[PDB]
Amino acid sequence: QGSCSLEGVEIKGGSFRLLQEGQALEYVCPSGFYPYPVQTRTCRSTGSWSTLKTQDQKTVRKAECRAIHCPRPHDFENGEYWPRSPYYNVSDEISFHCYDGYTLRGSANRTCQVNGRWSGQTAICDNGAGYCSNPGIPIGTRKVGSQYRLEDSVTYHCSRGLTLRGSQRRTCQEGGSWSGTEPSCQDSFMYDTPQEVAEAFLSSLTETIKRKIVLDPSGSMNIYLVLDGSDSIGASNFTGAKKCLVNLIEKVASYGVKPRYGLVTYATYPKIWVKVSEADSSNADWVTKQLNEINYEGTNTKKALQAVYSMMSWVPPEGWNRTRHVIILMTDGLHNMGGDPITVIDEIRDLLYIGKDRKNPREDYLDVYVFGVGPLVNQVNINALASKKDNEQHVFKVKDMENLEDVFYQMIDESQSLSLCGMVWEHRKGTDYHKQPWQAKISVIRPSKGHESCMGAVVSEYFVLTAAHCFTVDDKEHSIKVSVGGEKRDLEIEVVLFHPNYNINGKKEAGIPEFYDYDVALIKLKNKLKYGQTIRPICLPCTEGTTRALRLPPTTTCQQQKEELLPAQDIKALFVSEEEKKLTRKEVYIKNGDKKGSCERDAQYAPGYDKVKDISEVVTPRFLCTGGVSPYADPNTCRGDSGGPLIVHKRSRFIQVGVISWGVVDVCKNQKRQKQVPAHARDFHINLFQVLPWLKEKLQDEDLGFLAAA
Numbered sequence: 001q002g003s004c005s006l007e008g009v010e011i012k013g014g015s016f017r018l019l020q021e022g023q024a025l026e027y028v029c030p031s032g033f034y035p036y037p038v039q040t041r042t043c044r045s046t047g048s049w050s051t052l053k054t055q056d057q058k059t060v061r062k063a064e065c066r067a068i069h070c071p072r073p074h075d076f077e078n079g080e081y082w083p084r085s086p087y088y089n090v091s092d093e094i095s096f097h098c099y100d101g102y103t104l105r106g107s108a109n110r111t112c113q114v115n116g117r118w119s120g121q122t123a124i125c126d127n128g129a130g131y132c133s134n135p136g137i138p139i140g141t142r143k144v145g146s147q148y149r150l151e152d153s154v155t156y157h158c159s160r161g162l163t164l165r166g167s168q169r170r171t172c173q174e175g176g177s178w179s180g181t182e183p184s185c186q187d188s189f190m191y192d193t194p195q196e197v198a199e200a201f202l203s204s205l206t207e208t209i210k211r212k213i214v215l216d217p218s219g220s221m222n223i224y225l226v227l228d229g230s231d232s233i234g235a236s237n238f239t240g241a242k243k244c245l246v247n248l249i250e251k252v253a254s255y256g257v258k259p260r261y262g263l264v265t266y267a268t269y270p271k272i273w274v275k276v277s278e279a280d281s282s283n284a285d286w287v288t289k290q291l292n293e294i295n296y297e298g299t300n301t302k303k304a305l306q307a308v309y310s311m312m313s314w315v316p317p318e319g320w321n322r323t324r325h326v327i328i329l330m331t332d333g334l335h336n337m338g339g340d341p342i343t344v345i346d347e348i349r350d351l352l353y354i355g356k357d358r359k360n361p362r363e364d365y366l367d368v369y370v371f372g373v374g375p376l377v378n379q380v381n382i383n384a385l386a387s388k389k390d391n392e393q394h395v396f397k398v399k400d401m402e403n404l405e406d407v408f409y410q411m412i413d414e415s416q417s418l419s420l421c422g423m424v425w426e427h428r429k430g431t432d433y434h435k436q437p438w439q440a441k442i443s444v445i446r447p448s449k450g451h452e453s454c455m456g457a458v459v460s461e462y463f464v465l466t467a468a469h470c471f472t473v474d475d476k477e478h479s480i481k482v483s484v485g486g487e488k489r490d491l492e493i494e495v496v497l498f499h500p501n502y503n504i505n506g507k508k509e510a511g512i513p514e515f516y517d518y519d520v521a522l523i524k525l526k527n528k529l530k531y532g533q534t535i536r537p538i539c540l541p542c543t544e545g546t547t548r549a550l551r552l553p554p555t556t557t558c559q560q561q562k563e564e565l566l567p568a569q570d571i572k573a574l575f576v577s578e579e580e581k582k583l584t585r586k587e588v589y590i591k592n593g594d595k596k597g598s599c600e601r602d603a604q605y606a607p608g609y610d611k612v613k614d615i616s617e618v619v620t621p622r623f624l625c626t627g628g629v630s631p632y633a634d635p636n637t638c639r640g641d642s643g644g645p646l647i648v649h650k651r652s653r654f655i656q657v658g659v660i661s662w663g664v665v666d667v668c669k670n671q672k673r674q675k676q677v678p679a680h681a682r683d684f685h686i687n688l689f690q691v692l693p694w695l696k697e698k699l700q701d702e703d704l705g706f707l708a709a710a
């Protein structure tokens with residue numbers, strides 16, 4: 001129905017997006033900030049948007065993007081943690097310690113992450129004296145029940161405003177394990193990244209060898225794909241969901257198994273498109289064609305699952321107890337009408353004889369996975385339906401249909417060679433070089449003087465891309481060393497190739513001491529790099545690799561890539577910064593639209609450039625601009641980060657669009673110090689789309705598949 005004026009709804013330090021044809025909105029904040037007091041607003045029948053309220057229901061005059069905090073532990077049994085603060089800022093560290101007589105499991109040291117979650121696993125102090133282990137208290141939750149004898153239970157509770165994910169109750173079972181799965185508390189801003197979801201789903205569905213799906217000997221598997229099309233998932237005849245599912249089917253087929261598929265879409269009533277009992281339902285290619293053909297057109301989930309039950313049911317056939325069943329539900333709402341769908345899951349577990357025998361519980365024979373999409377999904381309800389299995393995750397919440405698609409594109413990219421450009425798997429126990437495998441450190445030794453330390457990016461097995469200003473003609477190759485993958489070993493180089501138009505010394509006679517135009521160089525290594533989990537290439541602009549990374553058709557041009565990667569907007573990008581051996585991603589915004597001119601003009605504030613009459617003489621068409629307070633407070637590069645890649649993270653892949661070149665002011669660590677970061681604190685980076693003929697030439701034997709560079 002009627003629409004609401006957007007006057008006055010702006011959020012300080014953030015933006016918003018419209019949902020449900022203008023009837024709702026969601027606020028959007030930079031990395032490390034969340035919308036206060038509310039994630040979403042609804043358009044009211046008055047023409048005004050819903051009021052901004054806190055928990056206690058105090059009106060807030062103005063919405064703001066506020067620093068994320070990780071929750072303080074409510075309690076820690078049989079030990080102490082420290083430091084103890086009301087709340088923790090991103091990158092705060094605590095540590096956990098047991099009392100005498102108790103032994104620590106889980107993570108001793110934990111760090112508050114950019115997503116509002118503590119790193120690692122729940123710390124537990126246990127004396128081994130219970131029938132069951134001490135189940136622990138995940139940070140953010142409160143536990144009721146402190147006896148761990150056989151058949152005792154513990155219950156968990158979240159704070160007002162938050163929602164519990166996982167088991168609200170766990171029960172101590174014969175053999176010494178707890179039923180259900182470890183809980184966590186979800187705040188309104190929290191989403192799972194596609195990379196996290198891709199690792200969590202795969203490691204739930206499969207066993208590790210490569211990976212495999214194990215069935216019974218002479219054993220079967222049925223997969224039920226259920227799509228709630230009541231809201232936006234049905235948009236464009238389920239186009240998004242079809243992409244996801246095509247990719248899922250393709251991934252499952254990689255494991256050599258031939259499952260039977262069911263396909264059901266639903267809203268008020270269910271539609272069965274493919275039935276598991278069909279002669280062709282185990283033909284992956286046939287099922288894929290059927291799925292691609294489906295179309296649209298309240299949320300009756302109970303009925304959708306009753307369509308699933310009817311596909312299952314059957315006195316019973318041979319090998320009924322040999323089949324494992326996987327339900328996959330995709331939803332952006334799940335506000336159920338027509339009854340609680342949970343009772344149907346109960347009926348299913350009766351049918352499959354699950355939970356009916358203590359000596360043979362048969363939990364392996366059913367898995368229900370729920371993928372929630374967007375800010376409007378009912379979190380209690382998606383969790384209620386999803387399986388609860390120890391050390392497994394079965395409930396996901398992603399931002400977007402685009403992000404849901406990214407989950408399955410990542411899963412498809414997993415088995416590809418390590419040469420796959422700008423792909424990073426979300427290794428659970430990975431370090432900094434598992435998260436930025438392309439990162440190179442460059443050192444140059446200079447007699448009686450400070451050594452140069454710069455950054456670069458691995459672009460092929462022989463090449464590291466960096467800035468030219470890290471080197472002069474006087475630097476012999478033996479003085480220059482490169483390290484990759486966080487290894488002590490520093491690698492010998494063959495040569496440094498400078499862009500042929502680069503000349504720091506200008507322009508010096510014209511009154512300009514440093515001229516950074518064309519500030520790019522390639523280091524050719526002496527020896528070929530062996531790729532691995534901590535050493536992998538980043539994607540470069542205008543190559544076949546990037547077309548594929550962006551999920552685009554093979555006829556895609558370099559102009560099409562530029563349009564996708566550097567449109568005339570404020571572009572979300574990132575660089576990697578090192579602080580005390582740790583690498584952290586710092587999100588920045590490239591001013592490539594109306595703000596470009598004002599970003600560029602701030603160069604006059606740079607030292608040496610104060611007398612420059614015409615700013616274009618120092619800021620050339622080769623340059624990209626980040627920094628400043630508009631639209632957002634951008635972080636700035638440190639001296640050590642120079643030459644490093646400026647990166648766009650799109651479709652689960654990392655594409656380097658720039659090289660970190662020079663900055664207006666050194667203001668780096670006003671970060672955790674304050675700040676007082678000036679509004680004219682800009683960083684200038686060399687745009688790689690502006691030096692492609694040189695790149696394509698130098699890297700011509702590296703098998704990168706460059707497109708037309710002119």
Ligand SMILES: *[C@@H]1O[C@H](CO)[C@@H](O[C@@H]2O[C@H](CO)[C@@H](O[C@@H]3O[C@H](CO[C@H]4O[C@H](CO[C@H]5O[C@H](CO)[C@@H](O)[C@H](O)[C@@H]5O)[C@@H](O)[C@H](O[C@H]5O[C@H](CO)[C@@H](O)[C@H](O)[C@@H]5O)[C@@H]4O)[C@@H](O)[C@H](O[C@H]4O[C@H](CO)[C@@H](O)[C@H](O)[C@@H]4O)[C@@H]3O)[C@H](O)[C@H]2NC(C)=O)[C@H](O)[C@H]1NC(C)=O
Pocket residue numbers: 064066067085087088089
């Ligand atoms: C964890 O991280 C948080 C977030 O970074 C951090 O919190 C900061 O803590 C410092 C030190 O305690 C605070 O600094 C104090 O500032 C007091 C003035 O506060 C008002 O003005 C701030 C400045 O506003 C300008 O700039 C900002 C950003 O550039 C811009 O948004 C504004 O428009 C404006 O131009 C403003 O940020 C601040 O707003 C916060 O707090 C209000 C609550 O009133 C809230 O409405 C906002 O949502 C926002 O969160 C506020 O309006 C100043 O009085 C004070 O001076 C004191 O000196 C010492 C203590 O240092 C004392 O003796 C005495 O109290 C003096 O008054 C001091 O300089 C800063 O405000 C915080 N920033 C926040 C909350 O955003 C924590 O320190 C980190 N550490 C941990 C573990 O908590």
Ligand SMILES: *[C@@H]1O[C@H](CO)[C@@H](O[C@@H]2O[C@H](CO)[C@@H](O)[C@H](O)[C@H]2NC(C)=O)[C@H](O)[C@H]1NC(C)=O
Pocket residue numbers: 095108109
């Ligand atoms: C928790 O962190 C502490 C402090 O950083 C770790 O102890 C240090 O570990 C490093 C790297 O292994 C050593 O170089 C130091 O000798 C240790 N110094 C100390 C005792 O302060 C500790 O290993 C961490 N605990 C874990 C991961 O269990």
Ligand SMILES: *[C@@H]1O[C@H](CO)[C@@H](O)[C@H](O)[C@H]1NC(C)=O
Pocket residue numbers: 236237295296
């Ligand atoms: C969905 O496809 C059907 C074809 O059966 C068509 O009627 C309709 O135009 C499509 N809807 C879209 C693309 O929004």
Ligand SMILES: *[C@@H]1O[C@H](CO)[C@@H](O)[C@H](O)[C@H]1NC(C)=O
Pocket residue numbers: 321322
């Ligand atoms: C399935 O049922 C039959 C008959 O009870 C039995 O012989 C077979 O072993 C069962 N399979 C199991 C235990 O999963």
